[PDB]
Design a protein around this ligand. Structure first.
Ligand SMILES: Cc1cc2nc3c(=O)[nH]c(=O)nc-3n(C[C@H](O)[C@H](O)[C@H](O)COP(=O)(O)O)c2cc1C
Lengths: 198, 197, 66, 194
């Protein structure tokens, strides 16, 4: 049996069906979360307030992921696993998080920065929940190349393209920290070592 | 008014072509909806006019529009434009909108000379990918037909004009070229006429 | 980049991941879309089939208003 | 430029235009069909396909939502024959005039309407049959079909008569498939008599 826990932010909200065996812990997190986000601003035109039900449960997973130890089986694990499975089955109908993020740009009025946040929150969560990406995703483009109805080529640019390339590296480190973090960090160690030896 | 009135009685007016310019969105909108026409014809001169045709087509995406493309090398009132260059620039944007039936004209006569445009392989010359057209228009070519009212002696006068390949049409601003010259009308528009005395 | 092309000429990341048929989008090869074709009637009259003749039901040649 | 092809005086306009059109067929056959007319796909009538876009016994129940185009596409079916022309052909021909398609107006979908198509995979014998509510109980009201080989009968039925027995108005149309653009034309002899 599940107890309705209304994650809300002024106007809009999302009804989360929490198993009553773990309502004690989830009501705790409803409280803490509900103060830290700001107050509504008529159409949600500010840069810390979610403009859709989807972003709201995004913000939530973000908060909950920050409180989890990635080794230690902490108090807030079984909460996170069941906030994802709500997020997946409601807003993410088999499709990937990036598809969702696109819908939200053209249908609603969310900014880029707002939906990169949503992307981070989901992807961060999945790794903190010990539910990694090991499934061969049924991406259309790759079902097609498997069959022979597509041929792919990868191309890599060089210089001349942008004034500040480095903001592209910044935006990679923020948003995909959990996937790329150890490559960025192995890069720097390698470059630092290459300076000292040269 | 006369078309609306005639179309409402059921007179067989399949289409209306608007020569010499392209209407504004709100006038074309009136011509599309209000008149009982299967399709509208537009004859743009410049790249800017080809854009104004695309905007009419975006705004009524179920209605067929025949973009009748004619270069400066055509008979009667003519633009200054090449026939090829503007198409190579715009063909891609025209084909985005699938209610534009894209029709070439200016300089055609036989099958042989117009086949490259049907096949698409005309744009292979200028190292673009093949780029084919939906139909052709023949003005000049048809003016010595049996059933046109053009006077027996003016048909002899036409047949005597040798004419000139595409590369040389632009000499008609200076002097007779294939027995043909440009000449300002009362408005100041150019016109290609047979260089009689 | 993630973003939205209005003209839909090219795609962004979405396409790589998308699972629906909005992931496999093909740009038009003009030579194949607008290939001219032949077609017959019951009466065995051959036509040149283009986007334009398909509509008007007559050959894709027109005499303009002179 | 066009002056280098103007050479033959008083050539009939048929012979010029046919000369170009046949010249294309000649060339298009040799490239893409290997000089073989058998490989040209045949249709009944060629025309009236806006540039924007196999079940025998079917039944279509219109609701107050049903989209008109989805609805008319379904009745016409896939094959290009009289039924295709009957339901998609934008208008028809009376003498020389071009009246809105009546067959399309009658079958314009609204709640309660029920079409049944019998022998849909053999045009010769096909019979579309609209049924509506008439005094609670649901009865046939319209019947499209072929009589003779190029006549479309659209029997419009009245069920509310003097003596209960129903009364039919046979509206006849010619189907001429050599006029691809408007292949349907109303038979106007004795129309007012009928
Ligand atoms: C004698 C003559 C009269 C024309 N009259 C008109 C006209 O009244 N309105 C118009 O829009 N175009 C007119 N045009 C242009 C044709 O419609 C068309 O653009 C041109 O004939 C095609 O070029 P071509 O003559 O080289 O085949 C005329 C062309 C000629 C040769």
């Amino acid at each position: 049996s599940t107890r309705p826990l209304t994650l809300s932010h002024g106007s809009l909200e999302h009804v989360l069906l929490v198993p009553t065996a773990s309502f004690f812990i989830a009501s705790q997190l409803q409280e803490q979360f509900n103060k830290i986000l700001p107050e509504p601003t008529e159409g949600f035109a500010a840069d810390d307030e979610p403009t859709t039900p989807a972003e709201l449960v995004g913000k939530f997973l973000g908060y909950v992921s920050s409180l989890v130890e990635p080794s230690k089986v902490g108090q807030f694990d079984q909460v996170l696993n069941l906030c994802l499975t709500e997020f997946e089955n409601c807003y993410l109908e088999g499709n990937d998080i990036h598809a969702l993020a696109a819908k939200l740009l053209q249908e609603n009025d969310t900014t880029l920065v707002k939906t990169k946040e949503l992307i981070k929150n989901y992807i961060t969560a999945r790794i903190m929940a010990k539910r990694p990406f090991d499934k061969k995703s049924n991406s259309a483009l790759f079902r097609a190349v498997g069959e022979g109805n597509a041929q792919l080529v990868a191309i890599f640019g060089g210089q001349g393209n942008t004034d500040d390339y480095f903001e592209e590296l910044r935006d990679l480190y923020q948003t995909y920290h959990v996937l790329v973090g150890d490559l960025i960090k192995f890069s720097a160690e390698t470059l630092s070592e290459l300076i000292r030896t040269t | 008014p006369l078309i609306k009135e005639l179309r409402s009685k059921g007179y067989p007016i399949q289409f209306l072509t608007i020569g010499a310019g392209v209407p504004s969105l709100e006038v074309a909108s009136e011509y599309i909806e209000t008149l009982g026409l299967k399709y509208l014809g537009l004859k743009p001169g410049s790249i800017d006019a080809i854009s104004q045709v695309i905007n009419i087509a975006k705004a009524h995406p179920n209605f067929p529009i025949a973009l009748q493309w004619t270069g400066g090398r055509g008979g009667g009132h003519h633009s200054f434009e090449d026939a090829h260059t503007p198409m190579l620039q715009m063909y891609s944007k025209i084909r985005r909108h699938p209610n534009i039936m894209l029709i070439f004209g200016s300089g055609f006569g036989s099958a042989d000379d117009t086949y490259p445009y049907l096949t698409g392989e005309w744009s292979t010359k200028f190292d673009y990918p093949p780029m084919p057209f939906d139909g052709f228009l023949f003005g000049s070519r048809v003016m010595i037909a049996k059933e046109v009212k053009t006077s027996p002696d003016a048909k002899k006068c036409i047949a005597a004009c040798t004419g000139v390949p595409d590369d040389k049409w632009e000499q008609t601003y200076k002097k007779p070229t294939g027995g043909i010259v440009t000449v300002r009308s009362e408005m100041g528009e150019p016109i290609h006429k047979i260089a009689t005395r | 980049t993630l973003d939205i092309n209005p003209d839909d000429d090219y795609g962004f990341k979405q396409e790589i991941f998308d699972v629906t048929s909005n992931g496999l989008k093909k740009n038009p090869n003009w030579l194949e879309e607008y290939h001219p074709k032949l077609i017959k009637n019951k009466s065995g009259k051959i036509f040149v089939e283009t986007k334009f003749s398909k509509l008007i039901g007559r050959p894709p040649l027109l005499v303009p208003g002179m | 430029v066009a002056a280098q092809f103007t050479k033959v005086i008083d050539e009939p306009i048929k012979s010029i235009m046919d000369g170009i059109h046949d010249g294309h067929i000649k060339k298009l056959l040799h490239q893409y069909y290997g000089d073989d007319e058998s490989k040209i796909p045949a249709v009944e009538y060629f025309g009236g396909e806006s540039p924007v876009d196999s079940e025998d016994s079917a039944v279509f129940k219109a609701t107050s939502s049903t989209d008109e185009e989805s609805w008319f596409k379904a009745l016409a079916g896939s094959e290009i024959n009289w039924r295709h022309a009957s339901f998609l052909c934008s208008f028809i021909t009376q003498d020389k005039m071009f009246v809105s398609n009546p067959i399309r107006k009658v079958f314009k979908p609204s709640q309660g309407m029920v079409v049944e198509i019998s022998n849909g995979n053999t045009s010769s014998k096909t019979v579309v049959t609209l049924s509506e509510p008439v005094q609670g109980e649901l009865k046939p009201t319209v019947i499209l079909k072929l009589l003779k080989e190029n006549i479309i009968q659209m029997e419009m039925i009245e069920n509310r008569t003097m003596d209960g027995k129903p009364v039919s108005l046979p509206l006849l149309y010619n189907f001429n498939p050599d006029n691809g653009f408007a292949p349907i034309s109303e038979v106007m002899e004795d129309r007012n008599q009928r």
